[PDB]
Structure 1
Amino acid sequence: DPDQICIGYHANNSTEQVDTIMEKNVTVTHAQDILEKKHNGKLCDLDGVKPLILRDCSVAGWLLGNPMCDEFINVPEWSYIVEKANPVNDLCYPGDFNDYEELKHLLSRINHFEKIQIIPKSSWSSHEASLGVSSACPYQGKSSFFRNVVWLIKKDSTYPTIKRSYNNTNQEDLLVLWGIHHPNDAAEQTKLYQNPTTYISVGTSTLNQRLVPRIATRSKVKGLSGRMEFFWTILKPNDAINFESNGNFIAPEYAYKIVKKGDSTIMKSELEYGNCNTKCQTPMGAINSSMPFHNIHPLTIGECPKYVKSNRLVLAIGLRNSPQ
């Protein structure tokens, strides 16, 4: 028979399929998926700074020192904050936290964080500083209160006008927290504070605040119709904060030195820490960021692939291959 030479191409046992713009389900010799679909099921460090994991506490409960919260363990830096969707321990005494969401945003990523004592609880010589407790804030089967602020009441049927300053001698910004108590009526007002008409003034180089208690007949929450309303400011190095009050004052004891060098956000996740490191965190697990696209979860923090609604993105590498 005459000799022959033929031109041809590779085939193999691949059953991998791709789609093309003109034809679906084309079998090819080799293909490559460019969609990331896997995660590690854990909360990880982000490059590689650990998150602040609040367990069963809200940011507010943690900052104010809700006694039902876990003991304050210092974490001097973090990359993001993790809260459970509905933290059980928030404001033990019912009330509100002013500009709460902005504060959470500010605290989401922190380079340095350090709790310091700014007004000793023992320095209140003319007021009662150790009766500021409620059954709504238990600590070890005893009525207690937020541990980082002090609920002052009258002493010997008198509440002298308070005038206290703290000067930020530190080299860092100071996050300062205080509050006001809104009682149920005028009888409770004078019972706690003696003075029937009261205020709290707070001044810094930028702050010019005067708070007054609001009476309303309010629904009982945890058996209480009273309310606490909390406020905060950032006190710059060498500025001073000046408090004046003749009642209803929830005074700072502790404040927080902060260094801020960028932001992130609050992640809602029910997972615990996994002693891992990642470049891209999602609430259901951390992911690689090698692939251009992913489909795991939209609420990511970090440097992530682009989020798409797709179950597969498979590129052809090899050639048309006869199917099985």
Structure 2
Amino acid sequence: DQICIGYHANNSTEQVDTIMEKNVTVTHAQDILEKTHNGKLCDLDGVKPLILRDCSVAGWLLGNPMCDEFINVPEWSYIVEKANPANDLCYPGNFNDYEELKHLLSRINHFEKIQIIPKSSWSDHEASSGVSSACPYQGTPSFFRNVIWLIKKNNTYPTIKRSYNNTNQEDLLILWGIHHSNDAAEQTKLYQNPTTYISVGTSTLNQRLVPKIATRSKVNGQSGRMDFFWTILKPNDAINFESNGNFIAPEYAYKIVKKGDSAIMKSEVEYGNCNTKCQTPIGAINSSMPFHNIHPLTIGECPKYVKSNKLVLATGLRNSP
């Protein structure tokens, strides 16, 4: 007559690693490493991303004519750019403080394009004549939608002195630019005056720009350059433009409410109408595990990224053969 003590055994071959033992098979186990994503791009706490397919943020803001598909969304949690968007700046040049702006627009609570200086209102200058082959609209020569390339009218370019008081209740994002011409002949053909400037002043801003008239290599067929600038005009403050040439004036500013930081995501994966609290450039993550090995560049409350393939915790006993 015998009585015996013993433990469970089953049909399991899941193995775990010990600090002194290698490949130990156990009854039950639990993996705490996430390695599954849904392959698509989704919202983030019920707020959709701003997906700019093929358009850079600069082109979207300025309105590259070859983009034009998106200034309608009032709120987003992150921005989706392709690794190297095709439509950045049709006319060559540089965007001042570009990355700082892109970070600022990483996550916007309320965003509303408005017109601040109507194209109609250019009495003494040529509004509808600032076009170029480098920024074409379906074959025809154009320019950025949201800024106006002013030109001399009736062989004159009288000194502009425009101002704007932000009567809105939100902050206003205004952009403008300056055109570096190539020689005195072009300079005076475009703007009548030879030596020009741009003064831009708010409470914070105290800027004056002079065009660099030199010779460069041609880019998108053009050897001129156009440099763009931006500012956040606080409510009730006023911006003062002044210029006798080479001005790229604003038509539209952007109402802006920032209550959060986020980060731009370079991805080609397509949106899939799915919500998550964690997102990667190759898919979303719906997990509660502490670790993942999917992708390092996450946005959201994510598990900590590891460079591991398994993280199995033994839960059962040792399995017998």
Which range moved further: 139-148 or 35-44?
Answer: 139-148
Root-mean-square deviation (CA, aligned residues, Å) is 0.7
- Asked if the contact 1:149–1:254 (Cα under 8 Å) also holds between the matched residues in 2, the reply is yes
Superposed displacement of residue 78, structure 1? 0.2
SS in 2 for 1:322: coil
Normalising by the residue count of structure 1, what TM-score does the alignment of the two structures yield? 0.98
User: Within 1, Cα distance between the matches of 2:87 and 2:9?
Assistant: 63
- Asked if the contact 1:289–1:303 (Cα under 8 Å) also holds between the matched residues in 2, the reply is no
Listed one character per residue, the Cα deviations across residues 13-48 of structure 1 (whole Å, up to 9, x for unaligned) are: 111100000001001001110000000000000011
The count of aligned residue pairs is 321
User: Within 1, Cα distance between the matches of 2:136 and 2:33?
Assistant: 50
Identity of matched residues, %: 93
- Give unpaired runs (5+ residues) of structure 1: none
Listed one character per residue, the Cα deviations across residues 252-277 of structure 1 (whole Å, up to 9, x for unaligned) are: 00000000001011100011211000
- Asked if the contact 2:71–2:113 (Cα under 8 Å) also holds between the matched residues in 1, the reply is no
Normalising by the residue count of structure 2, what TM-score does the alignment of the two structures yield? 0.99
User: Within 2, Cα distance between the matches of 1:198 and 1:232?
Assistant: 20
Listed one character per residue, the Cα deviations across residues 96-145 of structure 1 (whole Å, up to 9, x for unaligned) are: 10000000000000000000000000100100000100011111321110
User: Within 2, Cα distance between the matches of 1:308 and 1:166?
Assistant: 52
1:21 to 1:251, Cα distance in 2 relative to 1, 3 A: same
Superposed displacement of residue 213, structure 1? 0.1
- Asked if the contact 1:54–1:83 (Cα under 8 Å) also holds between the matched residues in 2, the reply is yes
- Give unpaired runs (5+ residues) of structure 2: none
SS in 2 for 1:95: coil
User: Within 2, Cα distance between the matches of 1:315 and 1:75?
Assistant: 45
User: Within 2, Cα distance between the matches of 1:20 and 1:197?
Assistant: 78
- Asked if the contact 2:200–2:240 (Cα under 8 Å) also holds between the matched residues in 1, the reply is yes
User: Within 1, Cα distance between the matches of 2:255 and 2:173?
Assistant: 6
- Asked if the contact 2:173–2:233 (Cα under 8 Å) also holds between the matched residues in 1, the reply is yes
Superposed displacement of residue 237, structure 1? 0.2
Q: Which residue of 2 aligns with 1:79?
A: 77
Superposed displacement of residue 73, structure 1? 4.2
User: Within 1, Cα distance between the matches of 2:25 and 2:270?
Assistant: 43
User: Within 1, Cα distance between the matches of 2:68 and 2:300?
Assistant: 28
User: Within 1, Cα distance between the matches of 2:158 and 2:79?
Assistant: 41
Superposed displacement of residue 87, structure 1? 0.2
- Asked if the contact 1:94–1:227 (Cα under 8 Å) also holds between the matched residues in 2, the reply is yes
- Asked if the contact 2:113–2:252 (Cα under 8 Å) also holds between the matched residues in 1, the reply is yes
SS in 1 for 2:235: coil
Superposed displacement of residue 150, structure 1? 0.2
